[PDB]
Amino acid sequence: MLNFKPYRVIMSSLTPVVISGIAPSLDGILYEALSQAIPSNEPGVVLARLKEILLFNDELGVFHASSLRFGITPEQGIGATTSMRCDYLSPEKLSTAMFSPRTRRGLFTRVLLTGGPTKRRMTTRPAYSAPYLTFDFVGSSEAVEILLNHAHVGVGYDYFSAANGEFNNVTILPLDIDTSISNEGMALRPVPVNSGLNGIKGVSPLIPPYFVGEKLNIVHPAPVRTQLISSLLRG
Amino acid sequence: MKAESLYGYLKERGYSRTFEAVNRNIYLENLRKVIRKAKQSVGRGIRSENDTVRIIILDPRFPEPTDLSSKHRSLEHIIPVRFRREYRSCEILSPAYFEEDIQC
Amino acid sequence: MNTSAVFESAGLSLRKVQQDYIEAAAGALTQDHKVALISAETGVGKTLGYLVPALLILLKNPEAKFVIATNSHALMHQIFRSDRPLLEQIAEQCGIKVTFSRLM
Amino acid sequence: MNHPVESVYSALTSILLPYMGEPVPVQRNCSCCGRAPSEFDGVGFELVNAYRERVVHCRPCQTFFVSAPELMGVENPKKPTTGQKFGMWSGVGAVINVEDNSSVLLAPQGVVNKLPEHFFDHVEVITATSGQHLEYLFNTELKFPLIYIQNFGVKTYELVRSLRVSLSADAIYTCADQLLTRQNEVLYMLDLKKAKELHQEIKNYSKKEMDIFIRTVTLLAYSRITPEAASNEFKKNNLIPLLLLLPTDPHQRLSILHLLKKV
Amino acid sequence: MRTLNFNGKISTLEPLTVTVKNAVSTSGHRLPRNGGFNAAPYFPGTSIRGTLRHAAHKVIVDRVGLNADGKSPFDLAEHFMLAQGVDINGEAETFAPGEINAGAELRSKNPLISLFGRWGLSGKVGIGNAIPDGDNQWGMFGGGARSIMFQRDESLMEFLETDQVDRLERLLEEQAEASVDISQIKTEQDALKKAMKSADKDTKAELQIKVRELDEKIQARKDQKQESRESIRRPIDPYEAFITGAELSHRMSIKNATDEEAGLFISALIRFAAEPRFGGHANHNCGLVEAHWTVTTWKPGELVPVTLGEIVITPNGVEITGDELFAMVKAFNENQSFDFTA
Ligand SMILES: [Zn+2]
């Protein structure tokens, strides 16, 4: 229970953002940030504290936290780059000082890195490299500023592991109209199908974390939305 | 020379930092000094609650509101926080890239 | 305590930001041998923002003083140009003394 | 039963029905597709792979590891007694019509040469390289729902876990043997409807204007030209409607452009 | 449990570079830029994460020690579990997909698999990217050229026998002819590529099955060289690195971590300070860094960062400041009940 005002948050993207099909919702970023702030992974308490910094739609069952929208400037636009993760079995990793390989003829059985359960996993994921990221939300500007600046949270699939979508220079500006849930009838974030908002059908939990809870039918915006930075700063 | 003096100090203190690193540090400290000095300059206006000021920065290097990636982005702190909306909606005397892109 | 009443009851048009600055200054001055660094943009009010904490801390342990160093020569007037009666009235409400000292 | 691998098995890999043998009762989930044994009716095929790992493959999954040289020809002459395997084909795709339960195999000319005559009798094969799959998909009238495998590849487990029914031409899910996570389906999702309408409306533009549009959009999607430059190029070449018909996603833009320059 | 945010700066002692397949192109080796060429590169957090995970795994190996036979107790399965979290033997606790706080037993028993995750267990350590703090802090380092030793120092020829001198002359002749052949083949390839940007589908297909055949001709000509497959007098392509003394803002964190897991992380950082190398091109001493990380935590309930201490890695030593950091380090040194063999 705190006075919530519609704010738009714009940050400078530093690394490619990997979208997990559904555009990353700022509510999820804030949920992760609070899970870091409150040393607890229990969804109930983290959600209860998230409602204190974000406006929650009871009738609609979501937080006022728009999905990711790529702020593109006339200098740099939305770019297609691959978030690229490779196992690097260095000579130090491949040495008897670190483990005991099975031996035959006194020779150490080399690890088959070309394939199998012990291969060099070349996991490549799509990622969108825009100069800025933007979200809208009806919440406390102080708490979200503190979280986004100091909590280890990024935009995309794995900021924790892959460090994808690192951001900085988080700038919050007030808005005039709440553009978190709806935008002239176009959902700007995951919402239930019965809400009457159009967009793209999908399956996902309405409330974060988006990897737990029954995946019920939802309507979500385009995964990759781009807007001019000048238009985003207009408010 | 302030860069040289600081580099010599750190070198004698044992810290291993290149001269250009000390130059960058001194440049950032000078930039913060400049931000404070121009904050003082702006503070010359709005001395009373009823005062109305039109602040006109004629410097090309002052960051445009839409150019959030300008090198001197910290200069936005010159504007008081309360008037940051007025910073966003400002008459630009010579805006760059002043067109309507289609890849929106 | 007297903090809430004595500001508004004395007739001063105190604002919330004034209350926050006054409370922060008072709490910082309560702590001993530390250093308090507060930025107070024009409009919050420094002439009375920190002097009212000084009076409030004067009420306790009333055997100390508070030097108020102001660089600009005009601001030393400003401390006692049109606010000396104001602070005197505040002292009359709080109750004990001002005992000014216009040092030069 | 009602899983992606079952449909492709029934439509396409049922040709090697004679060449597995009877199943074995199992008590653990199929390591290849990963679904529960409750939908296997308690039967499964035990196997040991080239990495010496005990793996259970259900009826529709085990077909990707069957050796049927007398039906599938020889894949490597150095080892005559192991023919082509569905799970080992690289560069070979297929389109499976689930409701009809039919399959069309998109293999390159080399694989078609390696296949015997008896193979074609059960499965219709059209010679197409890896890049010509999109040509077949665009030109031929697809029938939905369908399973479109783009690269059988060698990672059979990831292939089966990437299979997804394409319910309509708006979203055709390519199964390229790479694990179809929710992060990378944009690289494996093909919108034949949007590509088709864009191809229909591209006829109104010159070949020079076409090349210009494709190169500008490709550079923009790869962030090699500034958005202002691309906008100037589109405005000067009157390419605004084409951009309006493109998805905002740059990866989807690249995918549909790759499709366009193939047809 | 506590969330320890290591916010700090990495000052580069010698140029910091990394090879990334997407970033690297035929034009040259470029760092990941998250955009076009005229953008700010970032050192991947994946590379720092893997380096610190390797450091932590080495710390665990040292803590565990060696068997009576002088061989590490870890086998291939356990070694890969601890190094890269790949269960090769298919024997791992398949935690429930929806239960977040799963593996508390495994987390307590294996602090390494707790800090960095395994496949199916979310890691506790989030290693961010090293973002430069300037607009010009990267450059085309390395480069240079491989020079034939006997064409630079004539004295080195006094050691070669006349048979080997003739071998050298044959090598140089083969190199010259291979160069003058491959250059012409590449000129033809360039002309074909120039004709690739005015072609239609049919002639495109005709003139790109030709380029790869020219490449095969290049490979065959290189194979024809009897004395050396590759030219020795090679100009080395430069690699893009961060300049020496680049202040890169680095954001790391550990989430809801027991004091023992944080102690393992600090020990891994201390061990990393022995060879504080990030990235490749170690031949040119690339990767040497000195970093100062203010270790902060979150106040219970309040969204305020408390400063628990500082971690300053420098060539002169590791400076751990803050009592709680020492407490975590000793706690990790204690609790010998860790089980890295299961
Ligand atoms: Zn199966």
DSSP annotation of B94: S
Tell me the pairing of strands A69-72 and A226-228.
Answer: parallel
Residue E216 backbone dihedrals phi, psi, to 5 degrees: -65, -35
Please, are residues D145 and D163 in contact by the beta-carbon 8 Å criterion?
A: no
Q: Which residue, A147, A152, A155, is CA-closest to A83?
A: A155
- Location of structure tokens 């979501």: A62
Distance CA E86, CA E106 (A): 15
Distance CA A83, CA D183 (A): 10
Q: Which residue in B has a C-alpha nearest to residue A176's C-alpha?
A: B85
- Location of structure tokens 């970093």: E291
Please, are residues B75 and B35 in contact by the beta-carbon 8 Å criterion?
A: yes
Q: How far is the CA of E103 from the centre of ligand 1 (A)?
A: 27
Contact A128 D251 (CB under 8 A): yes
Query: What angle is formed at CA A28 by the lines to CA A23 and CA A32, rounded to 5 degrees?
Result: 135
Residue E113 backbone dihedrals phi, psi, to 5 degrees: -65, -15
Contacts within 8 Å (CB) and 24+ apart, D115-118? D115/D72, D115/D73, D115/D84, D116/D70, D116/D71, D116/D72, D116/D73, D118/D70, D118/D71
Q: Which residues 6+ apart lie within 8 Å of E164 measured at CB?
A: none
Please, are residues A161 and E126 in contact by the beta-carbon 8 Å criterion?
A: yes
Distances (CA, A) of B81 to B39, B73, B78: 12, 14, 9
Please, are residues E228 and E2 in contact by the beta-carbon 8 Å criterion?
A: no
At D209, the amino acid letter reads E
Please, are residues D3 and D35 in contact by the beta-carbon 8 Å criterion?
A: yes
Q: Which residues 6+ apart lie within 8 Å of E133 measured at CB?
A: B24, E9, E246, E247, E248, E249
Chain interruptions in chain D, by residue before each (C–N > 2.5 Å)? none
Report, in angstroms and rounded to the nearest whole number, the Rg of chain B calculated over CA atoms.
19
Per DSSP, the three-state class of A169 is strand
Contact E134 B24 (CB under 8 A): yes
Query: What are the start-end ranges of the H helices in chain A?
Result: 26-37, 43-51, 141-150, 159-162, 229-234
Q: Which residue, E133, E95, E124, is CA-closest to E11?
A: E133
Q: Which residues 6+ apart lie within 8 Å of E227 measured at CB?
A: E167, E170, E171, E174
Per DSSP, the three-state class of C22 is helix
Quick one: A1 exposed, middle or buried, by C-beta within 10 A (0-12, 13-18, 19+)? exposed
Tokens of E189: 């390839």
- Location of structure tokens 């029954």: A214
Distance CA D79, CA C34 (A): 83
Per DSSP, the three-state class of C13 is coil
- Method of determination is cryo-EM
Q: Which residue, E118, E224, E72, is CA-closest to A99?
A: E72
Touch between C and A (at least 3 CB pairs under 8 Å): no
Per DSSP, the three-state class of D208 is helix
**Taken in order E253, E258, E261, E263, is the CA torsion positive or negative?**
positive
Give me the sheet containing A200-204, strands edge to edge.
Answer: A191-192, A216-220, A200-204
Of E35, E90, E201, the CB nearest to D223: E35
Q: Which residue in B has a C-alpha nearest to residue E135's C-alpha?
A: B71
**Taken in order D27, D30, D35, D38, is the CA torsion positive or negative?**
negative
Q: Which residue, D222, C71, D95, is CA-closest to A77?
A: D222
Distance CA D183, CA A124 (A): 10
Distance CA E146, CA B37 (A): 53
Distances (CA, A) of C61 to C32, C54, C56, C64: 13, 12, 10, 7
Q: How far is the CA of D78 from the centre of ligand 1 (A)?
A: 30
Please, are residues A14 and A130 in contact by the beta-carbon 8 Å criterion?
A: no
Query: What angle is formed at CA D256 by the lines to CA D250 and CA D262, rounded to 5 degrees?
Result: 140
Contact residues, chain A, for B65 at CB < 8 Å? 233
| Burial state string for A74-96 with b = 16 or more CB within 10 A and e = fewer than 16 | bbbbbbbbbbbbbbebeeebbee
Contact residues, chain B, for E243 at CB < 8 Å? 20
- Please give the biggest Cα pair distance in chain D: 68
Distance CA D186, CA D181 (A): 10
Half-sphere exposure of C52 (CA within 13 A, CB side): 29
Q: Which residues 6+ apart lie within 8 Å of B9 measured at CB?
A: none
Distance CA E247, CA E289 (A): 10
Please, are residues A80 and D251 in contact by the beta-carbon 8 Å criterion?
A: yes
Q: Which residues 6+ apart lie within 8 Å of D6 measured at CB?
A: D60
User: What is the separation, in whole angstroms, between the first and last Cα of chain D?
Assistant: 36
Q: Which residues 6+ apart lie within 8 Å of D214 measured at CB?
A: D257, D260, D261
Of A81, A100, A117, the CB nearest to E75: A100
At D252, the amino acid letter reads Q
Distance CA E53, CA E232 (A): 38
Report, in angstroms and rounded to the nearest whole number, the Rg of chain A calculated over CA atoms.
21
Q: Which residue, E113, E119, E85, E128, is CA-closest to E253?
A: E128
Distance from CA of A142 to the nearest CA of D (A): 32
- Location of structure tokens 């289609």: B102
User: Is E97 an interface residue toward D (CB < 8 Å)?
Assistant: no
Torsion angle of the four alpha carbons D204, D207, D210, D216, in this order, in degrees rounded to the nearest 10: -150
Distance CA E32, CA A5 (A): 37
Please, are residues E41 and E319 in contact by the beta-carbon 8 Å criterion?
A: no
Q: Which residues lie across from D44 on neighbouring strands?
A: D24
Contact E36 D224 (CB under 8 A): yes
Distance CA E326, CA E309 (A): 10
Query: What angle is formed at CA D35 by the lines to CA E99 and CA D190, rounded to 5 degrees?
Result: 95
Contacts within 8 Å (CB) and 24+ apart, E30-35? E30/E240, E31/E138, E31/E240, E31/E241, E31/E242, E32/A15, E32/A16, E32/A81, E33/A129, E34/A13, E34/A14, E34/A15, E34/A16, E34/A79, E34/A81, E34/A129, E35/A76, E35/A79, E35/A81, E35/A129, E35/A130, E35/A131, E35/D223
Three-state SS for chain E is CEEEEEEEEEEECCCEECCCCCCCECCEECCCCCCCCCCCCCECHHHHHHHHHHHHHHHHHHHHCCCCCCCCCCCHHHHHHHHHCCCCCCCCCCCCCCCCCCCHHHHHHCHHHHHCCECCECCCEEEEEEEECCCCCEEEEECCECCCHHHHCHHHHHHCCHHHHHHHHHHHHHHHHHHHHHHHHHHHHHHHHHHHHCCCHHHHHHHHCCHHHHHHHHHHHHHHCCCCCCCCCCECCEEEEECCCCEEEEEEEEEEECHHHHHHHHHHHHHHCCCCECCCCHHHCCCEEEEEEEEEEECCCCCCEEEEEEEEEECCEEEEECHHHHHHHHHHHCCCCCCCCC
DSSP annotation of B51: -
Cis check for the bond before E238: say yes or no (omega within 30 of 0): no
At A42, the amino acid letter reads E
- Location of structure tokens 């490299």: A129
Half-sphere exposure of E269 (CA within 13 A, CB side): 31
